[PDB]
Every structure is written in structure tokens, then in C-alpha cells.
Design a protein around this ligand. Structure first.
Ligand SMILES: Oc1ccc2[nH]cc(CN3CCN(c4nc5ccccc5s4)CC3)c2c1
Ligand SMILES: Oc1ccc2[nH]cc(CN3CCN(c4nc5ccccc5s4)CC3)c2c1
Ligand SMILES: Oc1ccc2[nH]cc(CN3CCN(c4nc5ccccc5s4)CC3)c2c1
Ligand SMILES: Oc1ccc2[nH]cc(CN3CCN(c4nc5ccccc5s4)CC3)c2c1
Ligand SMILES: [Zn+2]
Ligand SMILES: [Zn+2]
Ligand SMILES: [Zn+2]
Ligand SMILES: [Zn+2]
Lengths: 358, 358
């Protein structure tokens, strides 16, 4: 089964990385153990959605393409290694983002930097190592592959887009005209930059390239199937589903119980440009806008409660339903367009959408 | 002249990166200005020793190889872009290291994260962007080059070695057997791991791969000259000169005036495994070892003063002279061995050594 293959490959790649640290980097057993625990704590525990998308896209093509059994095994192993490169890339950004944001919990456990024996001094570098491991995986496992060049180039572009998206996210509550490294940044008072187009830019870059575009294209590359698809359609469907995924996350930050969320959501306190805040400002009257401005971005729990009441009273569930209906309509249209050149790839996209939507 | 070409290429690469952010990443002018200032503040102001080594190695080969003038210009431009990849890689590690270490100043100015309009939340990501820019440079400028694969593979290996070296450095005052992410780390009390071999491991990985190996090998790659040298000799001379460079830095941290150093050195307070501490413990009597243990790794200025007195009284200048004489002897021996296959490359190494030694 796909998941068991994927998890077995994690143990293989971990053993390869740690054994290389011992044979080539002069590591001692205690530091190798620290790095093993860091890898497990930061890479494991999630749903493996991104990595398993690579595997599922590759399985779709195997079902319809003639190959010797050894070639089928090679392609699946490559899809698993590629999927772990994306999981380790995500692990890098979660470790760093948690330190940047001063976060407390991630997936029901303390953020890595908060572990007593880690601290920010080590965790920033541990995050650097996580992303370096993605490149060590690629050069080792894909050394003789025809797709190595395209895969590394895609991966770099996606990583850069993600870092640019993090910049857009962390500065989303500043007035753009005031940004200046030499001057402490005040929070926006007018919220003029909390618009659907600005929110779409943040989300497109901060999450959609690594959560949807990279796994789908990597599945095509390891399958040597990229010429069988219209790349512009793949980008459009990846950016569309990815935005919906971030809207779901934004709603959950505000209203999903902390036990289910795996943390205490603080987007209101952090003055984030969330879908809820943009959608609220898109329908609020003058008194509602004024109440929002007087309470948003404040740690005071009573102020956070005022904001959640404004969102609840504004009936944002109706705006979410209209948005969800439009996304269902557009994703189904793109899936139809993908069937022109590849019904197998269109089906993988339908699975990815179904898993996101539910 | 070499320096003017190198600086002109910085402006070209900066314009390329920022123009790409506008045409492909939807950046606005204010964020483009923030990134321009971040690039200038974190990449410029140093001696450009690493980047200029690439240029000097390439100039050496141009002097003895037949090429059309357009090819000479292409090779020099590539050497400048490669040199800036290494300068931006260093910029990434300085930004992150300063945050990890809680540093105050770097090159006579505040550390980047301390700028009022930056903060740790932005600076960690700015550091991530600096390293991503090295890959954008490579894929753009070297897209059609025969050396692209080897250059990217070398660069990844050097980056990984550096991150591993940072782990060795940050944990150098812990007892290895006590390292555990779940347990807050006490400082060593026995200093048994402050040995010449453990110090050599820290230094080899944390600085020598990116400061000496990477510039020398990159100069060979852009010149298509790597088969003209014995790679094992290049590694040995790079690791040897690089260690001497770090010993010089360690002595300067303790005894160079802050105005000349560009910061207030705090290796004693930070309990670093410095050359001074290892060399002191290698010659101290029992009472001197006990006094060192009672004062090292403490913020108290009177305790720091006791350590500097112990170092001064131990006549560490005599150990430095013996070490320096041994390094001069070994670097000259390796330069001689390099002349067997390439007198031009051996001369570049002699220049690199001369610039380091003085
Ligand atoms: O999650 C937390 C943890 C601790 C906390 N303490 C106080 C808070 C509540 N907010 C106070 C204001 N604010 C700001 N953000 C920016 C970003 C850019 C420019 C100006 C501002 S003003 C976010 C945090 C909080 C939240
Ligand atoms: O004032 C508060 C504070 C905390 C609270 N926790 C739960 C609640 C009660 N409802 C508030 C509104 N709601 C939403 N569901 C969606 C789904 C999609 C998009 C927007 C929304 S809005 C369901 C829960 C509540 C109220
Ligand atoms: O530069 C500074 C800035 C602020 C400061 N405050 C106090 C100090 C002085 N030292 C106190 C002890 N110490 C430790 N390091 C480690 C690392 C690993 C394991 C245990 C320890 S115990 C370094 C700092 C200091 C220095
Ligand atoms: O007690 C103190 C405290 C601060 C101080 N600043 C300057 C001093 C006075 N000398 C102390 C020793 N020295 C060193 N030069 C080298 C060079 C190579 C290797 C080891 C050393 S040791 C020169 C300056 C001093 C003393
Ligand atoms: Zn964040
Ligand atoms: Zn969120
Ligand atoms: Zn450091
Ligand atoms: Zn130093």
C-alpha cells in the first residue's frame, strides 16, 4: 500500500542521512541522536498530504503506462523520496515560522524551539538543516535521473516563492508606504490593504506553491509525464485549490476548538490579513468597521471576543458558502480542461480536491 | 580592474533580482525597497575576500589559456556571479547566526535583526531569502553552462557542511553525552571536550568549506579547470588555511579593540570552544584549570577579566607563534605539491594565503 511504502522510505532516507553524517561529517552518536529526534519531531505527525500527492500522481500514471516491474518500483521509490523532500521543506518552514511568530504549539505538541534542550539558538539552525536535507536527498537518490535538473529547478522556484510569501504574510498588517528597515513599524489603522486581491497575493505565495503546485508537478516529473499536461492549467488549479485550503485554515484558526486545531489560534491578536478580516471589511457598515478597528490586533481577550462576535454577527458562513460554491465550480471546470490531455492526471487532481474539500 | 568588475556585477545581479520580483512575484515598490536595503546591508561592507578569490582564480587561468576576448569576458562575469553567490551565502549565515547568538553588532553596525523596522520575525526570513537568491543567480546566469551541475552540487555540499558546523559550534560547550532535545543543557564543568581535535572539527565545518574550499573550487569550475588540479590537495590546503583564519578570529574576539573588531567580543561569556581556551587548557597547571572553570562562560565582567588574565599569563602568544610557524610550513608544502599539475592555481593559493596571513 502507498502509505506503508512512503513511511518505509522515510526510515530509509533517515538512515541514509544519519549514516552519511557519521561516515563523511565526523558526527558523534549523541549529535546524530539529536538530529534523529529533530527529524522525527519536525517531519512526522501530520497527514503527509503533500508527499502522498506525489505518490498518488505517480500511481495514476503507472496504471496506464507499460513498464517492467523494476521500473514501476523505481518510479514509486522516486515519488516517495520526492514526497519526503516536500515534507522536509514544509518542516523547515514550520520550524522557522514558529520561531518568527513566537508560536507555542504545533500539531498538539510544543513548537520545536520550545523544547527545553533545543532553544531558538539551535532551532533556527535545525530548520536550516531540514531544508539542506532536501537537497542531499535529491542529489543522492536522483543522481542519474533525467528529471534531476527540472526537479531541482522547480524546487528552488517553489522555495523562493514561499519565502517571498512569508514576507508578504509577516508584513500584511503594516501600511506598505511606511515599510522601512530603519523605522519601527506601526500596525495599519485604515486596513486599506485588507482586500481580496492583496489576500490572494499573500496566500498564492506563502502556501499554494509548496502545498499544491510542487507535489503535483513533482509527481509528473518522476513519472516523466510533464509533456502530457498543459502546465498553465496545473498552475491555475494548484493556485485555486491552495487558496481554498488557506481560507479553511483561516476560519479554523478563529473558530476550531484548540484541541482539534492543535494550538490556540492567535490570528486576531497578531492582526493577520485573514480571509475572515478581509471578508468582514467587505460587508461591514461604518459602525462595524469602527468597532473592528478599535479591537483588532490586541492581546486583550475581551478585545479578541469583540472581533469574534463581529465576525459571527456579520454571517461570514454565507460568504464562505458563496466562495466554496464558486471554487467547486472553478475546480471542476479546470479538471474538465485537464481531461483533454490526461484523464489520469485530471483524476489525481479530483482526488487532491476531494481530500481538501472534506 | 577586478574589484570594479565585481562591484558592477553586484549592481547587475541586484537589478535582476528586484526586477524579477516585480515582473514575476507581484512585488510592490515598498517591499522591493525593503529587500534592496536588506541586500545592501547584509551583503556589502566586508572585504569581499571569498567572492574575489573566485575572480582571482579565474584571472590566473585566463592569463595562460587561449580564448577569444568575448570568452574572457564571459568567464570573468561568471566568476563575479559565482563570487556573489558565496557572498550572499555568507550573508545568510551571518544574519541567522547573529539572531541565534543574540549578537549586538556586526562590522561596526547593528546586526540586521536589531534594525527597528526589521525585528527577528522578519530577519529570519530575510536570511532565508538571501540563500534563495544564490540559487536564483545560479539558475539564471549559468543556465546554459557546462559547469552548472557541478557548481550546484558543490554549493549544496558546502552549505550542508556549514550548517553541520554551526551545530558543532553552538553545542561546543555542552557535554556530548548530555545532549537531549527534551532536557535543558547545562554547560560543561570538566571541559574534557575542549581538545585540539574537537576544535579542529568545529572549525573545519563551520567556516573552512565556505570561506576557502568553495571559492577556490568555484574559480576552477567557472574556468573549466578542475581536471588540471589534484582535488585532494585543494581540500587539504583549504581546510588548513581556513583553520588558521578561525584561530586569528578567535584571538581577535578576545584581544582586538571593539572599534577595530566591529563588535564587543563575547566568546568567553558564551563559553565558546575557542583556540584560546583549548590552548590554555593544553598547558595550564591544576590551579590555573580550577580558576578557568570558576570564571569561564559567565557574563560578570570581573569573571571575564580573570579569564583574559589567565590567557595573558599563560603566554598564549608563544603557542600562537609555534602554530603559525607550523601552518606556514604546511601551506608552503601544499603549494609546492599544487605546482606539479598547475603553477597558476598554486599562485592563486599563495595569494589567498598571503592575504590571510597578513
Ligand atoms: O500571539 C501574541 C503573543 C503576544 C502578544 N502580545 C501582544 C499581542 C497582540 N498584538 C499586539 C499588536 N501586534 C502587532 N503586530 C504588528 C506587526 C507589524 C507592525 C505592527 C504590529 S503591532 C500583534 C500582537 C500578542 C499576540
Ligand atoms: O463569538 C464567538 C467566539 C468563539 C466561537 N466559537 C464558536 C462560535 C460559534 N460559531 C461562530 C460562527 N461560526 C462560523 N463558522 C464558519 C465557517 C466558515 C466561515 C465562517 C464561519 S463563522 C461557527 C461557530 C464562536 C463565537
Ligand atoms: O553574550 C551574552 C549575552 C547575555 C548573557 N547573559 C549571560 C551570559 C553569560 N553566559 C552564561 C552561560 N552560558 C551558557 N551557554 C550555554 C550553552 C549551552 C549549554 C549551557 C550553557 S550556559 C553562555 C552565556 C551572556 C552572554
Ligand atoms: O587581561 C587583558 C585583558 C584585555 C587585554 N587587551 C589587550 C591586552 C594585553 N595583551 C594580552 C595578550 N595579547 C595576546 N596576543 C596574542 C596573539 C596571538 C595569540 C594569543 C595572544 S594573547 C596581546 C595583548 C589585555 C589583557
Ligand atoms: Zn507565520
Ligand atoms: Zn493559519
Ligand atoms: Zn555563532
Ligand atoms: Zn569569532
Amino acid at each position: 500500500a502507498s502509505m506503508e511504502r512512503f513511511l518505509s522510505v522515510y526510515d530509509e532516507v533517515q538512515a541514509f542521512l544519519l549514516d552519511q553524517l557519521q561516515s563523511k561529517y565526523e558526527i558523534d552518536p549523541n549529535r546524530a541522536r539529536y538530529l534523529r529526534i529533530m527529524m522525527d519531531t519536525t517531519c512526522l505527525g501530520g497527514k503527509y498530504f503533500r508527499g502522498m500527492t506525489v505518490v498518488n500522481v505517480a500511481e495514476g500514471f503507472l496504471a496506464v503506462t507499460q513498464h517492467d516491474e523494476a521500473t514501476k518500483e523505481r518510479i514509486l521509490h522516486d515519488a516517495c523520496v520526492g514526497g519526503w523532500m516536500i515534507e522536509f521543506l514544509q518542516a523547515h518552514y514550520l520550524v522557522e515560522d514558529d520561531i518568527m511568530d513566537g508560536s507555542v504549539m504545533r500539531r498538539g505538541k510544543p513548537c520545536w524551539y520550545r523544547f527545553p534542550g533545543v532553544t531558538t539558538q539551535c532551532a533556527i539552525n535545525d530548520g536550516i538543516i531540514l531544508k539542506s536535507w532536501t537537497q542531499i536527498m535529491a542529489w543522492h537518490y536522483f543522481a542519474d535521473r533525467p528529471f534531476l535538473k527540472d526537479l531541482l529547478c522547480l524546487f528552488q522556484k517553489v522555495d523562493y516563492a514561499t519565502a517571498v510569501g512569508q514576507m508578504y504574510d509577516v508584513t500584511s498588517m503594516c501600511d506598505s508606504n511606511k515599510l522601512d528597515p530603519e523605522v519601527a513599524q506601526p500596525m495599519t489603522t485604515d486596513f486599506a490593504e485588507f482586500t481580496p486581491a492583496i489576500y490572494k497575493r499573500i496566500v498564492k505565495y506563502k502556501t499554494t506553491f509548496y502545498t499544491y503546485l510542487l507535489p503535483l508537478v513533482m509527481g509528473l516529473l518522476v513519472s516523466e509525464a510533464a509533456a502530457s499536461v498543459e502546465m498553465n492549467l496545473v498552475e491555475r488549479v494548484a493556485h485555486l485549490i491552495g487558496e481554498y485550503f488557506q481560507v479553511q485554515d483561516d476560519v479554523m484558526d478563529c473558530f476550531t476548538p484548540p484541541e482539534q486545531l492543535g494550538k490556540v489560534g492567535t490570528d486576531i491578536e497578531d492582526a493577520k490579513c485573514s480571509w475572515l478580516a478581509v471578508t468582514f471589511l467587505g460587508k461591514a457598515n461604518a459602525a462595524q468597521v469602527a468597532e473592528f478597528k478599535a479591537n483588532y490586533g490586541e492581546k486583550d481577550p475581551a478585545k479578541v471576543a469583540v472581533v469574534k462576535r463581529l465576525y459571527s454577527k456579520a454571517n461570514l458562513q454565507a460568504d464562505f458558502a458563496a466562495y466554496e460554491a464558486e471554487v467547486v465550480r472553478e475546480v471542476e471546470s479546470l479538471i474538465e480542461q485537464l481531461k483533454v490531455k490526461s484523464p489520469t492526471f485530471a483524476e489525481s487532481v479530483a482526488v487532491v480536491w476531494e481530500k481538501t474539500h472534506k
